[PDB]
């Protein structure tokens, strides 16, 4: 028994933290640790060798950025645990981890060892009352308010499409690809270096990421815009210098639709959506084409809807009606879902208690999850 459960969306790009019932996540910060590279010589300097969130955003130049989790897989647990320690700090939430239950939102088709280690931290380090792991796709629909529908969630770490019927995810029709937002930022960097703009440093790559998010358009006809001479729109850098992006603006984000550009022998994002529906039974295909939901950060590109709809038509069967629904709050659809689920009385039965974890161990979270 507790006051109010805390929802924590373990996003690859940014961590979204808030209480169940809250309309928006109150505390959103980037999911990386910044350590100072330069030597401290003078007294009354910035104290601490660890900077997370707005403290790392303000003094970014001083710090070396290292992301603990890549493609939704935690490589460094020491850094990931310290970030969850920061979630309960005086900056974000400012509450006792033993007092409030936690709801975590993990990517689909993750290893079981991740959930087992994740559970150990919150029951051993943080002595949480109860922990409930939830899928990203199911929560996105709960937010939108549809029980049946295909969730095309193109995140910072991974892109995946989950066909869900009456709140149940079809484990055999799930399609996930490693290519995500981080690959577009690195792929754009390759074009900027060829144009003659170098961003070698990890601190400089965050500016390329800001440039990528600011200036990238998804062309309706690729070859037409390649052949036409661009205006070479200038972008103002932090120092004051101006860069001419030119054709690299729309040529970088094409990777999502053509993985052949980076050299990875995978299907395009438009093929993932159609292929995932075609795998499902004949009776649902028509409903799944009728109920398509867009999610993830990489869907925010201008003209994504018009380009995707055109690509789906080519791959989709003839005489099929295609209705693609994109909520205005795409980024916060997973969290808002967690807030609704946590608010439901059934949630009291759904989560795993600290006592149940101590008795059965790793089995406890596997039994009351699966």
Partner 1 sequence: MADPKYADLPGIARNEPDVYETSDLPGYESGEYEMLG
Ligand X SMILES: Nc1ncnc2c1ncn2[C@@H]1O[C@H](COP(=O)(O)OP(=O)(O)O)[C@@H](O)[C@H]1O
**Measured from the CB atom, is 90 or 198 closer to its own copies?**
198
Identify whether the C-beta of residue 136 lies closer than 8 Å to the C-beta of residue 105.
Answer: yes
302 lies in the binding site for partner 1 (CB under 8 A): yes
Judged by CB under 8 A, the chain residues 25 through 84 that form the site for its own copies are 36-46, 59-62, 64, 73
Q: How far is residue 163's CA from residue 85's CA, in Å, rounded to a whole number?
A: 35
Residue 328 CB, shortest distance to partner 1, in Å, is 5
187 lies in the binding site for ligand X (CB under 6 A): no
Identify whether the C-beta of residue 63 lies closer than 8 Å to the C-beta of residue 34.
Answer: yes
Q: How far is CA 328 from CA 8, 11, 113, 154, in A?
A: 21, 19, 35, 15
Among 14, 285, 290, 361, binds its own copies (CB under 8 A): 285
Residue 149 binds which of partner 1, its own copies, ligand X, none (CB < 5-8 A, kind-dependent): none
**Measured from the CB atom, is 77 or 95 closer to its own copies?**
77
From the list 315, 326, 330, the residue with the least C-alpha distance to 277 is 315
Residue 127 CB, shortest distance to its own copies, in Å, is 27
- Report which residue's Cβ sits closest to ligand X: 297
Residue 3 CB, shortest distance to its own copies, in Å, is 22
Q: How far is residue 346's CA from residue 343's CA, in Å, rounded to a whole number?
A: 9
Among 177, 331, 342, 352, binds ligand X (CB under 6 A): 331
3-state secondary structure of 365: helix
Among 155, 259, 268, 338, binds ligand X (CB under 6 A): 155
Q: HSE-up of 261 (CA within 13 Å, CB side)?
A: 18
298 lies in the binding site for ligand X (CB under 6 A): yes
Identify whether the C-beta of residue 17 lies closer than 8 Å to the C-beta of residue 6.
Answer: yes
User: Token pair of 367, please?
Assistant: 């039994």
Q: How many residues bind its own copies (CB under 8 A)?
A: 73
CA gyration radius, the chain? 22
Q: How far is residue 262's CA from residue 254's CA, in Å, rounded to a whole number?
A: 10
Q: How far is residue 235's CA from residue 245's CA, in Å, rounded to a whole number?
A: 7
Among 215, 300, 324, 340, binds ligand X (CB under 6 A): 300
Contact positions toward partner 1, by CB under 8 A?
23-24, 28, 294, 297, 300, 302-306, 308-309, 313, 318-332
Contact positions toward ligand X, by CB under 6 A?
9, 11-14, 155-157, 181, 213, 296-298, 300-301, 331, 334
């Amino acid at each position: 028994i507790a006051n109010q459960p805390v929802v924590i969306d373990n996003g690859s790009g940014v961590i979204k933290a808030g209480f169940a019932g809250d309309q928006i996540p109150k505390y959103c910060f980037p999911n990386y640790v910044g350590r100072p590279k330069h030597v401290r010589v003078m007294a009354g300097a910035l104290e601490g060798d660890i900077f997370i969130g707005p403290k790392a955003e303000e003094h970014r130049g001083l710090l070396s950025i290292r992301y603990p989790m890549e493609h939704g897989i935690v490589k460094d647990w020491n850094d990931m645990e310290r970030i969850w320690q920061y979630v309960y700090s005086k900056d974000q939430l400012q509450t006792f981890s033993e007092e409030h239950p936690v709801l975590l939102t993990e990517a689909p088709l993750n290893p079981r060892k991740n959930r087992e280690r994740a559970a150990e931290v919150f029951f051993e380090t943080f002595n949480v009352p109860a922990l409930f792991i939830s899928m990203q796709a199911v929560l996105s629909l709960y937010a939108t308010g549809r029980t049946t529908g295909v969730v095309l969630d193109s995140g910072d770490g991974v892109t995946h499409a989950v066909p869900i019927y009456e709140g149940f995810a079809m484990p055999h029709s799930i399609m996930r690809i490693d290519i995500a937002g981080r690959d577009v930022s690195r792929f754009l960097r390759l074009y900027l270096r060829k144009e003659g703009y170098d961003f070698h440093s990890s601190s400089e790559f965050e500016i390329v990421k800001a440039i990528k998010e600011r200036a990238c358009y998804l062309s309706i006809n690729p070859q037409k815009d390649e052949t036409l001479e661009t205006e070479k729109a200038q972008y103002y850098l932090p120092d004051g210098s101006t860069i001419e992006i030119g054709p690299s603006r729309f040529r970088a984000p094409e990777l999502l639709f053509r993985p052949d550009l980076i050299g990875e022998e995978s299907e395009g994002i438009h093929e993932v959506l159609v292929f995932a529906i075609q795998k499902s039974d004949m009776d649902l295909r028509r409903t799944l084409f009728s109920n398509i939901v867009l999610s993830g950060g990489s869907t925010l590109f201008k003209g994504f809807g018009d380009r995707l709809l055109s690509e789906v038509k080519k791959l989709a069967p003839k005489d099929v009606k295609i209705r693609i629904s994109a909520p205005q709050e795409r980024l916060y659809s997973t969290w808002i879902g967690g807030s609704i689920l946590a608010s439901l009385d059934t949630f009291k039965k759904m989560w795993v208690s600290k006592k149940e974890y101590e008795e059965d161990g790793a089995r406890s979270i596997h039994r009351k999850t699966f």
